[PDB]
Structures are given as structure tokens and as C-alpha cells.
Amino acid sequence: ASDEEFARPTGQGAEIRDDGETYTTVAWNATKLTEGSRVTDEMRDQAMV
Amino acid sequence: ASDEEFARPTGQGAEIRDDGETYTTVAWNATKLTEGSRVTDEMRDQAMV
Amino acid sequence: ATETQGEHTFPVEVLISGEELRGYTAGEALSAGEPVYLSGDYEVSASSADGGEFLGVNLYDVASGEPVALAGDDCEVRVEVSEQVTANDEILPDGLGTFETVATSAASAGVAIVQEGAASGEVCEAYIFAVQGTTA
Amino acid sequence: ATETQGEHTFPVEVLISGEELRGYTAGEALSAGEPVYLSGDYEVSASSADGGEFLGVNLYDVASGEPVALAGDDCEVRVEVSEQVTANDEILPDGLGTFETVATSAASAGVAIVQEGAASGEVCEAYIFAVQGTTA
Amino acid sequence: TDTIVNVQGSFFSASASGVADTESLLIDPQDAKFGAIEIHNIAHGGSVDVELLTSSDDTELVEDAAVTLDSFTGEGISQGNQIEASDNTNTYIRITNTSGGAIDIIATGREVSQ
Amino acid sequence: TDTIVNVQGSFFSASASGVADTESLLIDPQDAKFGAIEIHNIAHGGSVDVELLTSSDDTELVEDAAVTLDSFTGEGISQGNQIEASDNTNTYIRITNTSGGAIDIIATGREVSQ
Amino acid sequence: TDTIVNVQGSFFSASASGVADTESLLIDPQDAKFGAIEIHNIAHGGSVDVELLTSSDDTELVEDAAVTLDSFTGEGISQGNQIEASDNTNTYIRITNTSGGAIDIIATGREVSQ
Amino acid sequence: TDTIVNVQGSFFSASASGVADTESLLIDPQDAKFGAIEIHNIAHGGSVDVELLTSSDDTELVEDAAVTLDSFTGEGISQGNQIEASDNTNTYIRITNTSGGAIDIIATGREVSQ
Amino acid sequence: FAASDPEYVDTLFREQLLEVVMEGRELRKVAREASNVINANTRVGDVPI
Amino acid sequence: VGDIAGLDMHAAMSSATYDDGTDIGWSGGSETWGFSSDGDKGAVVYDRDN
Ligand SMILES: [K+]
Ligand SMILES: [Mg+2]
Ligand SMILES: [Mg+2]
Ligand SMILES: [Mg+2]
Ligand SMILES: [Mg+2]
Ligand SMILES: [Mg+2]
Ligand SMILES: [Mg+2]
Ligand SMILES: [Mg+2]
Ligand SMILES: [Mg+2]
Ligand SMILES: [Mg+2]
Ligand SMILES: [Mg+2]
Ligand SMILES: [Mg+2]
Ligand SMILES: [Mg+2]
Ligand SMILES: [Mg+2]
């Protein structure tokens, strides 16, 4: 939503002017964060951990 | 109202003297503050709020 | 403008009809029925002669810097004229707080049309149809 | 036309005051605050320069063939300008989706009066008071 | 070990524009918040006499003692002075114009404890 | 017995590159955080007139009093000054270029308590 | 990081008006609340001898040692001195008029710790 | 009543050994922990130009304004200067060798608050 | 124009005057707490020292 | 903060709210609302009932 404003100083009998609540968005665009690791079968067998 | 003053020293059987409450005014002159907005009926239906 | 009824003076009702009633700030002291133009941002001052300076007529007396109401176009108005006006005369500001005919001014088009004729210094009934500003 | 409040840009509300809001059909894709003229029967397209092509301003974005709401004369509007406007400047369509002054244009009469001044590319506040069609 | 930053003083100034052909600027320590003054700079838009006075009154000027410190000739600045005055010692500094017309006088310094 | 280290209070500087033949650097105490300044150094890439001004307005220079302190000739440094200016006393320092062309001006000193 | 503003000194002055042809102003550190004084300014309304004295009594001047520091001539100001005196060292400063007629004398300085 | 001991400053120095026939020592206030410097002593093993510069970058010297303060001939000491520079004003002091052979340069002063 | 305040401010109504009068400066009253108070039997009298 | 120097209410106000005369139809006050430079009025201490 738009910021709050100050009401307007006006004459008598004058039109009340429009300054309506105005809207926008922030767009999220979720980015795929990825991580890989590869290990050989002999490595997996021989390692202590 | 005027500020508080001090009573006057007086003889006995003597005429009491006058320093009564004196007055003034502070003016106000209110200004009209106005705010307006307009919404279409279709906007009013469709909005999530 | 004002109306004598014996010993009494009455204010003249500037607005005959219409809803073009819009809020501005007075750039000087303005009186009811006085023609005005934009001197600053939403700020209005008394019109000068020969056109290019008209937004509306001041509805009520104001001091400098106070919020003013104007009748703009599509208002029928009671206004004071500096010369004789007949019906169907086009009028614009005279620069004297009053209106004159297009025919008398150096301008070629007006801002209001006289519905009810008046003599010099008296109230005509006119319809506001245009605004005039800076064209160079 | 758009407004900045921090990092945010907001769509400007084209209409400040007025009730001269009228339905047409878009002859092309139109954007909010764009000056428009009659291109066919109840059909409006964006105005070219130098006058003779103004009915009002487009109140929201439309594709070609869609129903447009138009703000006519009697509307106070937030509109974008291509040059510096002072209050009391007359403005008319630029041909570029914007308004320019009568002084700059090859025309000699405008369609709106500037109520709040603005720089080039900024949003002025204006009152629409006239229509321009073809005169030959 | 304990490390503090020192701001070097509290500022004081008296100034007058268009002081007439025989008039003066009275530099009054009662205008200082700490009660005493030390004038370092006198900038003078023309010729001036500088006078130091003791008053016989605690708050007004009623000349008890007076000494003309120096006469400055032409437009310029005297800087790095230590002309000293306070309220409780009833001391005033007077800068008197001696030029054939009006001048501007700017005096600056710092406040000292009463 | 209590022992304290004194570091001197805030450095102050105003500078301009390529100031034109009749233009000026205006040293404004509003730029200091303590509100008041003492100018020790004026470095000039050509001849300059130094002028001390009082304003009639609290925030902008609208000249009330003006004294030309001195004129410096050629390129160089003036150091060991105590030219004094304050925002609350509305004093400003103007260094005006008087060379037949553009110069560089750097002025430095320290902030003093207002 | 901690920042302190330094207001300098506590003010000190002694003065006399119309001191006669061979009489003196006795500047006495007993009048300082910190017990000791450093005198910067001697304003003299005529010729004066400055004399520095130790007293053999704690509270009154009974001369033990005396030295005439300098002789000033005419009406004028001597400034930026550091002439120095304290009560526990029983030191007094005497300014003696030598003008052959009555003069005004103003001395100013600051209090120093005893 | 409270009595405090004042130890002055924090020490600042820049030095170069055998700076070449036309090269320079760049004194940078970023090397000081308080971010501003006041140079008092310049010792030079031969003739030098002293130059005061403002940078257009917050961290590196990219010359904006430049003034040659003075030129020192021969070998010796300049003392009691107050050449001032700071990091957030991006001020710099350059000592340039003009002797035509290799020289040693030592600048000393103290740190000042930013 | 139509009927409005600035036209008829002193002809169709009177500007309000507030029903409450606002007080001036009040001086601090402490003497009775701050001293020995004698409610004397006589206008003149003596205290033995 | 609501109970300092004998005061019993703190009324924290915004930077924007004083009338600087930049908004349309608002005719600016005499002062500067702020606390940054000479003549800046940064606080008002007062009787709520006056
Ligand atoms: K119309
Ligand atoms: Mg808004
Ligand atoms: Mg009687
Ligand atoms: Mg009374
Ligand atoms: Mg309307
Ligand atoms: Mg006194
Ligand atoms: Mg006293
Ligand atoms: Mg100021
Ligand atoms: Mg003793
Ligand atoms: Mg003893
Ligand atoms: Mg930097
Ligand atoms: Mg920085
Ligand atoms: Mg008795
Ligand atoms: Mg002030």
C-alpha cells in the first residue's frame, strides 16, 4: 500500500479531491539454489568416514 | 484571565481598593481538512481485501 | 457585488446553478464575484484585462493565503460588468474585478455568455463556458 | 505516469476530481493518462501533435478493441508532460503519449490548464476544459 | 590508558553592522553562559579604539576604571589576543569606531569559567 | 592520580577545485558537527581575499556585516591562524579567488563547541 | 571514544581606579578560590612598575624578596604574560604607579591550582 | 577538586628511506587509528616540495584539488607546522623529492578525531 | 454564493465564546508549610527570645 | 522516557508532520522542525491543558 498522506486544506463548498489508496507489488521470483557431490564406489568403501 | 496578583497592605477601618480580574481572548479560525477516494464496484468485488 | 434595498445592503449570490465548485489558495485578497486566474500551484489571483487569465469567479471574500472556493465552467453566475451587456454577449475579465465584452477587449474569444443583460456597474447573469490560460 | 515512495513505483491515479467519465472503444492499445481522440464511431486512438485531436484522457490500460473509460472536460487529472509547465500554462497532446504547452506546439489553443507545475517527464495536475475535433 | 577526545573550547562572539562614526560595540560577559570571556579576534571594517572598563555596578555599565588598550588603523584583523572580562569582576570591553563614517565590527573568542 | 590520554577534537575542512576568477569558497560552520569552527590553515593555488561575514538569516548567508581580513598573493599556505566562526552567531568565512584564472583552495582546522 | 568539551580556566582580575602618583595595586592570590594565579594582561592608564614579592607572613605583605620585573610607559596593554603567584608560597604582585598623577589599572588572568 | 593527569595525543609518523630523485612520500590519514592527522615536523634529507591534495575517491588518491604549500631547500627540519588531513574528507599530504638524488624523509605529528 | 460561513459569520450566527475561562499564572503557595504559623488572638503581640 | 524532568507524557512526533509550507494549501510555519542546525526546534516542553 501507498504511504499515509495529510488531508488537504479546503474552502467551504469546494469539491473534496481524490487521493485514494494506491497499490503496487514486489514480485518474488524464487531462484533454484543447487549443490552436488559425486563419490566413486571404491572411495566410499575405503574411507574411514 | 489575567495573572494572579498580590493583595494590598491596608490601614484599619480603611477603604479596600480594587485590582479585580481583567480579561482577554485567544481566537481560533479552524481550517477544513479533506480527503477523498473512489473505487469501482467491480474492483470492490474482485479485491482480496 | 452588493444589492441596495432601502437602508440595507445585501451580498449578491454569485452562484445561480452548477457544481463546478473547486478549492484554491488566494494569492491576494479576493472578493465575492471577482474573476481569477492561476498565479501559482493551486494559487489564484485577480485576472487582468485582454484574456489569457481566467479559471473562475471567487465565491466568497477571502484574505491572502486563505482557502478559496471558485465557480468554474458550467456554472451560471451573477457578476458585475464595466459596460452595457445584452443577452448573447461573450464576456471576459476587465482587470477591474469586473467583466467586459469580448467586443470591447483586445481578446477574440470569451469565458462566459450573458443570459440576462445589465447596465454598467450592475449584475448580469452569465454562464461560464471556458477557461483561459497562457498560450504565448 | 508513475509515483515514487522509496524503492516503490506506484500507478498514478489519473482522476483528481470530476464525473465526466465516458465509455469508448480502443482503436489501439492505450495506456493510463494517454490523450485520445475519435478514430471511428465511438472509437478512440492516441492523439497526434498540433491539435484537432482531443476528446479526453484514458483512465486505465486497454488492449485494442476493449472498452475505455475516458476523462473529458470538467475533470481534474494527473498527467505527464514532455516539457516544463508552470501553473496557468495551457497544454494539449504532444503526439508522444504526453502533454506539451500551446506555446511549444504549432497549435494556438489548448485542452487543459496546468494547476500544479512540473518538469519535463514529471506529473503535472491539470484541469481538462476543452475538446478538439477536425475543422478542416 | 583511559582515552578521551577534547573539544578545545566554547565559542563566543559579538558583532555589529554599520556602527556609526563615534559609536561602540559593548562586549558584555553577561552574554556568555560560563560568565567570562576571552576575546582572541577583533575584525574591524575601519579604524577602532579598544577600551577595557570596570563597572561600579554589578550588572549595568557605570565606569569605575577605563584603559584604552590599543588603536587599530584601517580595515583588518587583530588575532591571537587574550582580552579578558567577566560579570563578577564587572569587566567590559568597548570597541569604538574612529573612522569618518559607519563600519562593521566582528569580535570572537571563547568562554572561560567565572 | 587518575591518568587520561587527550586526543584533540574533530578535524574540520572545506575545499574547492577550480574555483573561477571572481568566485569563492564559503566556509560554513553548519558543516561541523559541533556547530563551530576554528580555521588554522588556508592553502591557495593563487591569490585570494579572505572575508569574515555575519548573516541576517540563521541558515543562509544574507550579508549583514563584512570585513576583508587580508589578501594573500600567489600560491602558498597560511598556517597558525585562529579564524573563528559559529552557526549560532551566524558567522561565515569567504575565501575569494582574485587570480586571473581558476585555482584550488583547501582550508583546515578544528571544530570548537558552539 | 568518550568525547569531552573543555572550558578553560577560572577567571581572575584585580583592578583600581584613580590610584595615586606613587601608590599601588596589590594583586593577592588569597582572592583566588584555587589559591594561585597566573596573570596574562596588565592594562595601565599611564606608566607603571611591575614588582613581584615574597612575604615573610602568610596573610599580609611583609616583604622578604622583591624584584622589579619591568617598567611600562604611557597608556597601554601588556598581554600574554605568565606572571605567577600563590598563597602557600606567599607571593604578591605589586603594580606601582609612576605617572606623577592618578591612573586606572586592570590586571586579568586565570586561577591555577595551589 | 578532582585532579587528572593529561598525556597528550597519539603519535603519528610516516617515513621513507632513499625516495628517488623525483618521487614522493604520500602521507595518508587512513593509517591513523582516529582517521585524522596533524603533521608538525617534516625532516628532509635534501630539497622537497610539500603538496596538499583532496581525492575524488574515498580510499585512494585521485587528485581533485592540489596546492603546493611550500618548498624546502637543503637538508633540515621544519617544526611547529599544523598541516592537517583526514580520511572522510579524503585529504592527503605529498612530500616530493626535488634534490636530483635519493633522500630520506620523516614526517611526525599526532592523531586528531575525524 | 450559497449561504456560507465567511459571508454570514456575524449576521446568521455569532463566533463561539468558550464557556470555560482559562486560568492565568498561578504563584506557588508554601508559606504555611514553610514556617511556624501562629494563629494569633491579637493583631499585635510579642514572641519572647 | 515517558517520566523525565517532572513530565509524565512523551509525545513522539514524525519529521514530516510540521508545516514547512511545501504541501499544497499548507502555508508554512515560522520555525524549522528538526535537530541538526542553528534555530532547529527539536522539542517542545509544555502543559497539556494549556
Ligand atoms: K465544460
Ligand atoms: Mg498522493
Ligand atoms: Mg471613598
Ligand atoms: Mg494590577
Ligand atoms: Mg467539478
Ligand atoms: Mg557584574
Ligand atoms: Mg558578584
Ligand atoms: Mg545560524
Ligand atoms: Mg599565605
Ligand atoms: Mg600554608
Ligand atoms: Mg576516505
Ligand atoms: Mg566516508
Ligand atoms: Mg508590643
Ligand atoms: Mg540560534
Contact present, G and I (at least 3 Cβ pairs less than 8 Å): no
The stretches of chain E forming alpha helices (DSSP H) are none
Neighbours of J48 (CB within 10 A): 8
Tell me how far apart the alpha carbons of residues E83 and G40 are, in angstroms, rounded to a whole number. Answer: 9
F13 contacts in H (CB within 8 Å)? Answer: 84, 86, 89, 91
For residue F87, give the nearest of F49, F32, F42, F17 by alpha carbon: F32
Length of chain G: 114
Q: Which ligand is nearest to the CA of B16?
A: 3
How many whole angstroms separate alpha carbon E10 and alpha carbon F7?
17
Query: Is the Cβ pair B34, A5 closer than 8 Å?
Result: no
| Cβ-contact A5, J17 below 8 angstroms | no
Place of cell 579604539: E49
Task: Give the distance (Å) from ligand 3 centre to CA of residue B15.
Answer: 7
Listed as own residue / partner, the contacts of D92-98 with beta carbons closer than 8 Å and 24 or more positions apart are D92/D35, D92/D51, D92/D54, D92/D132, D93/D35, D93/D37, D93/D47, D93/D48, D93/D49, D93/D51, D93/D53, D93/D54, D94/D35, D94/D49, D95/D47, D95/D48, D95/D49, D95/D50, D97/D31, D97/D34, D97/D35, D97/D46, D98/D35
Distance H2 CA to ligand 5 centre (A): 76
Min Cα distance B1 → chain I (Å) is: 5
- Give the closest of B4, B23, B25 to I25, CB-based: B4
- For residue I7, report the phi and psi dihedrals to the nearest 5 degrees: -75, -45
Q: Is J13 helix (H, G, I), strand (E, B) or coil?
A: coil
Q: What does the block give as the cell for G114?
A: 595551589
Residue D120 to residues D83, E72, I16: CA-CA distances in angstroms? Answer: 4, 58, 49
Q: Which three cell numbers stand for residue E81?
A: 589576543
Rounded-to-integer distance, Cα C1 and Cα C32, Å: 7
Q: What is the largest CA-CA distance in chain G?
A: 59
Grid coordinates given for E109: 573568542
* Contact (CB<8Å) I24/B4: yes
Q: How far is the CA of D18 from the centre of ligand 1 (A)?
A: 11
Strands (E), A1-49: 8-10
Q: If you count them, how many residues does chain F have?
A: 114
The cell for G100 is 606623577
Distances (CA, A) of C102 to A29, C90, I31: 64, 6, 82
The C-alpha cell 592523531 sits at: H111
Binding-site residues on chain F for chain H (CB distance < 8 A) = 1-11, 13, 15-18, 40-41, 43-45, 75-77, 79-80, 104-106, 108-110
Tell me which DSSP letter residue B12 carries.
T
Which of B31, B36, B39 is the closest to A16 by Cβ? B36
Residues of A in contact with C56 (CB under 8 A): none
SS3 H31: helix
How many angstroms separate the alpha carbon of residue E90 from the centre of ligand 9? Answer: 26
Q: Give the CA count within 13 Å in the CB-facing half-sphere of C52.
A: 12
Whether chain A has a CB inside 8 Å of the CB on B37: the answer is: yes
List of E strands, J1-50 = 32-33, 40-41
Strands E76-78 vs E35-44: parallel, antiparallel or unpaired: antiparallel
Q: Note the residue count of chain I.
A: 49
Nearest Cβ partner for D88 among C20, C73, C134: C134
Which 8-state DSSP code applies to residue D120?
T
CA distance C123 to C85: 10
Cβ-based contacts of A22 with chain B (< 8 Å): none
Please list every residue in chain I whose beta carbon sits closer than 8 Å to the beta carbon of residue C14: 1
DSSP result, D35-101: EEEEEETTEEEE--SSSS-BSEEE-S-B-TTSEEEEE-TT-EEEEEBSS-B-TTBEEEE-SSSSEEE
End-to-end CA distance of chain D: 32
The DSSP 8-state label assigned to residue E88 in this structure reads T
Residue G1: partners with Cβ closer than 8 Å, 6 or more residues away = E3, E5
Provide the pairing of β-strand C21-26 with C43-46: parallel
C-alpha cell at C83: 459596460
Q: CA-to-CA distance for H29 and C3, rounded, in angstroms? A: 82
Specify the length of chain J in residues: 50
Q: What is the DSSP string of chain C?
A: -EEEETTEEEE---EEE---EEEEEESS-B-TT-EEEEEETTEEEEPPSSSS-BSEEE-S-B-TTSEEEEE-TT-EEEEEBSS-B-TT-EEEE-SSSSEEETTTSS-SS-SEEEEE-B-TTSEEEEEE---B-B--
CA H37 – CA H84 distance, rounded (Å): 6
Instruction: Please tell me what resolution, in angstroms, this structure has.
Output: 2.4
Q: Dig out the grid coordinates for F67 from the structure.
A: 570585513
CA A3 to chain I, closest CA, distance in angstroms equals 34
For residues E59 and E43, the answer to whether their CB atoms sit within 8 Å is: no
- Distance set, CA H59 to CA B1, G94, H91, H92 (Å): 66, 60, 10, 11
A19 in contact with D at a CB cutoff of 8 Å?
yes
In chain E, residues with a C-beta closer than 8 Å to the C-beta of G7 are: 9-10, 34, 111-113
Q: Does residue G113 contact residue H1 with C-beta atoms inside 8 Å? A: no
Judged by CB atoms closer than 8 Å, whether chains meet at F113 and E11 is answered as yes
Q: Which residue has the cell 504547452?
A: D101
Question: Which of these, H92, B41, E90, E75, lies nearest to F67 by C-alpha position?
Answer: E75
Question: What residues pair up with G53 in beta bridges, in sequence order?
Answer: G66, G92
Contacting residues of A for D12, CB less than 8 Å apart: 22
Q: What order do you get walking across the sheet with E48-55 strand by strand? A: E24-27, E91-97, E48-55, E63-72
Determination approach: cryo-EM
